[PDB]
From TrEMBL, chain A:
<comment type="function">
    <text>Major capsid protein that self-associates to form 240 hexon trimers, each in the shape of a hexagon, building most of the pseudo T=25 capsid. Assembled into trimeric units with the help of the chaperone shutoff protein. Transported by pre-protein VI to the nucleus where it associates with other structural proteins to form an empty capsid. Might be involved, through its interaction with host dyneins, in the intracellular microtubule-dependent transport of incoming viral capsid to the nucleus.</text>
</comment>
<comment type="subunit">
    <text>Homotrimer. Interacts with the capsid vertex protein; this interaction binds the peripentonal hexons to the neighboring penton base. Interacts with the hexon-linking protein; this interaction tethers the hexons surrounding the penton to those situated in the central plate of the facet. Interacts with the hexon-interlacing protein; this interaction lashes the hexons together. Interacts with host dyneins DYNC1LI1 and DYNC1I2; this interaction might be involved in intracellular microtubule-dependent transport of incoming viral capsid.</text>
</comment>
<protein>
    <recommendedName>
        <fullName>Hexon protein</fullName>
    </recommendedName>
</protein>
<comment type="similarity">
    <text>Belongs to the adenoviridae hexon protein family.</text>
</comment>
Length: 48, 82
């Protein structure tokens, strides 16, 4: 095998990521949106 | 007066039109009313002008950006009902 490494002879074979050679496309899953909020929480306000 | 949030929050006269220039609208936003829009915004820098009631003989006052209108009754007129 050549899929493992060894320091003794600087032994490691170069490779590449699979998905980089051929990409895929499925979009993603994003039904739920994502929200930021004010550090306090209510920000605006109005004397009462 | 103006900012990313100075004109994005609630419109309150106790906020925008008071401590800078109060150029325009921020005296109209608070009330949503273009009637005293330019009959009151002239009184932001130099003080009021009709508070003295220059018109005598029971004559009403009207403020303009530089000159004052004095409405005196039938048979009465004048620059200050004078
Ligand atoms: Ca302010
Ligand atoms: Ca306003
Ligand atoms: Ca305003």
């Amino acid at each position: 095998d050549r899929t493992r490494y060894f320091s003794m002879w600087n032994q490691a074979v170069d490779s590449y990521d699979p998905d980089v050679r051929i990409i895929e496309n499925h979009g993603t899953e994003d039904e739920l949106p994502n929200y930021c909020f004010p550090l306090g929480g209510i920000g605006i306000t109005d004397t009462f | 007066a103006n900012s990313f949030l100075e004109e994005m929050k609630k419109g309150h006269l106790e906020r925008e039109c008071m401590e800078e220039t109060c150029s325009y609208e921020e005296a109209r936003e608070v009330f949503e009313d273009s009637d005293k829009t330019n009959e009151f915004w002239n009184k932001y820098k130099d003080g009021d002008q009709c508070e003295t009631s220059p018109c005598q003989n029971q004559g009403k006052c009207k403020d303009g950006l530089g000159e004052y209108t004095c409405t005196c009754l039938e048979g009465f007129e004048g620059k200050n009902c004078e």
